[PDB]
């Protein structure tokens, strides 16, 4: 378990910024939201839910050579690039994405789910 | 027939520049060389045999997109470009070439031989 201390809490259901709150996390789920067990101190930060990007293509990235690298590159090279792409996406603040095309992405999803 | 009047004649067999000469051409072959019938006046020009380029590739020309245009272009497009390539080569002064690779070149040779 862990107790997260947000300084300001954004209510997505309404769209308003509330006051200080304390989040109680256990077994990967939120159990309690009390206004005002390890402690994570985020009293200086605005505390938000994770973002979702509904249109991504994690198996490619456009470049000046994009059209040529469809007859030379194999899916394993795309898989090796997708590791860094996915880490960058997660570090940017997006904890969920909807991939809208590509054959490497289901394998990447299975690999991420397995740790 | 035709009588060509060179001002100066280059002797390829020896490698020296001779004096004025008159060439007699009939049936596509040289018949008579006389030092000093239509007349072609080239008394102001140095009169040389046609050149031969022993290493050409008339079916292609390098460009920034050369490597990509091997999965998009068909041989007919290369054939359409080879017409201008061959005309430019002939106008540059080269009446004979040795093509050292490519599948369009035998067809271009057959087309040129047929007129």
């Amino acid at each position: 378990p862990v107790a997260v201390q947000c300084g300001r809490l954004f209510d997505a259901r309404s769209g308003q910024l509330k006051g200080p709150h304390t989040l109680l996390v256990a077994d990967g789920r939120i159990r309690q939201v009390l206004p005002g067990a390890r402690v994570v101190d985020l009293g200086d930060k605005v505390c938000l839910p994770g973002w979702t990007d509904l249109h991504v293509h994690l198996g490619s990235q456009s470049s000046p050579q994009s059209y040529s690298e469809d007859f030379r590159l194999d899916p394993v090279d795309h898989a090796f690039r997708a590791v860094g792409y996915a880490e960058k996406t997660l570090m940017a603040g997006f904890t969920s994405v909807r991939d809208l095309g590509g054959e490497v992405s289901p394998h990447l999803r299975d690999a991420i789910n397995q740790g």
Side-chain angles (χ1 to χ4, degrees), chain A:
Chain A
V2 54
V4 188
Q5 297 201 357
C6 326
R8 308 200 253 183
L9 191 77
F10 171 74
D11 189 35
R13 203 89 94 192
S14 70
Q16 322 270 111
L17 207 56
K18 295 171 172 297
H21 276 78
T22 286
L23 269 58
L24 261 305
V25 181
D27 294 46
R29 304 235 156 196
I30 287 180
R31 295 173 341 136
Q32 236 121 75
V33 197
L34 310 114
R38 202 161 37 82
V39 176
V40 178
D41 206 336
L42 305 159
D44 209 348
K45 315 300 171 174
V46 185
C47 156
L48 251 73
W51 293 324
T52 297
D53 201 327
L54 289 168
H55 201 145
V56 307
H57 297 284
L58 273 171
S60 50
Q61 189 167 282
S62 77
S63 83
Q65 297 114 36
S66 269
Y67 286 87
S68 50
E69 313 316 287
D70 188 54
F71 309 91
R72 318 277 197 194
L73 291 182
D74 274 307
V76 280
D77 310 281
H78 295 303
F80 282 131
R81 289 173 193 188
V83 169
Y85 296 159
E87 181 129 17
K88 259 155 181 231
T89 301
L90 174 74
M91 287 324 144
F94 294 81
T95 63
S96 207
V97 292
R98 192 175 61 155
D99 210 297
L100 287 198
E103 298 301 352
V104 177
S105 267
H107 304 284
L108 178 68
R109 167 203 68 199
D110 292 341
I112 291 173
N113 285 350
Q114 280 147 27

